[PDB]
Every structure is written in C-alpha cells, then in structure tokens.
Amino acid sequence: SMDDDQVAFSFILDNIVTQKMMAVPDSWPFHHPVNKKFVPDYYKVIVNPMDLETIRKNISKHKYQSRESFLDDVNLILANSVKYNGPESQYTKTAQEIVNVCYQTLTEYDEHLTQLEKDICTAKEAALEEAELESLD
Ligand SMILES: Cc1cc2c(cc1N1C(=O)c3cccc4c(CCCO)ccc(c34)C1=O)n(C)c(=O)n2C
C-alpha cells in the first residue's frame, strides 16, 4: 500500500540521518535545535531553523515524500550556518560535510528512493481522483 511505501521511504531517510549525517565528526552542534538561552539572537537572525532531530521528527510524521523535499531541509542546516556564522566558520564547514554525506548516501539508494517517491505520488493522486469522483455523486 501507500502506507507500506511511506514506511519504507521514511526508514531509508532515517538511516541516512542516524548512520551517516549524525556520524559526521564534530556534528554535535547540529543534533538538536539551537538553545536560545546560549544563543539569544539565533531565532531573530534565522527565520527557518533546522536541525537533525527536527528532520527525524519530520520523517516519523512522513513529511518527506521526495528526495528533493528531504534535501531541502538538509540544505537549510547549511544555509542557516552560512547566515549566522559565515562561510569560514567551523560550524559552516561541518554543516557542509553533513550535506555532502547526505547527497552521497542518497546517490547510493537513489533507485529505490526514486521508485518509492513515484509510487507514493501515484497512490496519492489516485486517492484524490477517487475522492473527487465521490464529490461528484
Ligand atoms: C550553543 C550552540 C551554538 C550554535 C549551534 C548549536 C549550539 N548548540 C550546541 O552546540 C549543542 C551541543 C550539544 C548539545 C546541545 C543541546 C542538547 C539538548 C538535548 O540535551 C541543545 C542545544 C545545543 C547543543 C546548541 O544550541 N549552531 C548550530 C550554531 O550555528 N551555533 C552558533
């Protein structure tokens, strides 16, 4: 079903986060949301915060239905570090390594992720057609 596909898709993404992204050396700043007590202006500067725990919560709620949607939140971790810390910061260098490891692992599982993403979308569209047909009475 679409539900089994959603589960298989989210399982692969979660393993990318936990086995690859969270394992990047010195990735500790990125495993949780920034604590505003320690960085009081963070959420004034950064409009769309993102971190690896939040990505995992999003995966568990099946927010991501495409490789692109996932990568977009992953890219946000890096973009936010560029904005807050600058390109030359160690924070930014580490965030880039996290993004790179994500791309390399997506590459590795691309065939299966691509077929799941297609199958999920097709099932979703078919359910919507069914609902629209039922609205038409
Ligand atoms: C202080 C800081 C500055 C940052 C930053 C992240 C952090 N920061 C940690 O490094 C950090 C390390 C380890 C544990 C943490 C927990 C644990 C919560 C559950 O027990 C919560 C919050 C933080 C951390 C955290 O806010 N980022 C991404 C930046 O760009 N700056 C400038």
Swiss-Prot record:
Q: Which stretch of the intact protein is present?
A: 1522 to 1656 of 1893
Where does the record place it? Nucleus
- Whom does it interact with, and what assembly results? Component of the TFIID basal transcription factor complex, composed of TATA-box-binding protein TBP, and a number of TBP-associated factors (TAFs), including TAF1, TAF2, TAF3, TAF4, TAF5, TAF6, TAF7, TAF8, TAF9, TAF10, TAF11, TAF12 and TAF13. Interacts with TAF7; the interaction is direct. TAF1, when part of the TFIID complex, interacts with C-terminus of TP53.
Q: Origin organism of this chain?
A: Homo sapiens
Q: List the disulfide bonds.
A: none
Name of the protein in its database record? Transcription initiation factor TFIID subunit 1
Tell me the domain of life: Eukaryota
Leader sequence range is: none
The UniProt similarity line reads: Belongs to the TAF1 family.
> Looking at the record, which disorder is this protein connected with?
Dystonia 3, torsion, X-linked: An X-linked dystonia-parkinsonism disorder. Dystonia is defined by the presence of sustained involuntary muscle contractions, often leading to abnormal postures. DYT3 is characterized by severe progressive torsion dystonia followed by parkinsonism. It has a well-defined pathology of extensive neuronal loss and mosaic gliosis in the striatum (caudate nucleus and putamen) which appears to resemble that in Huntington disease.
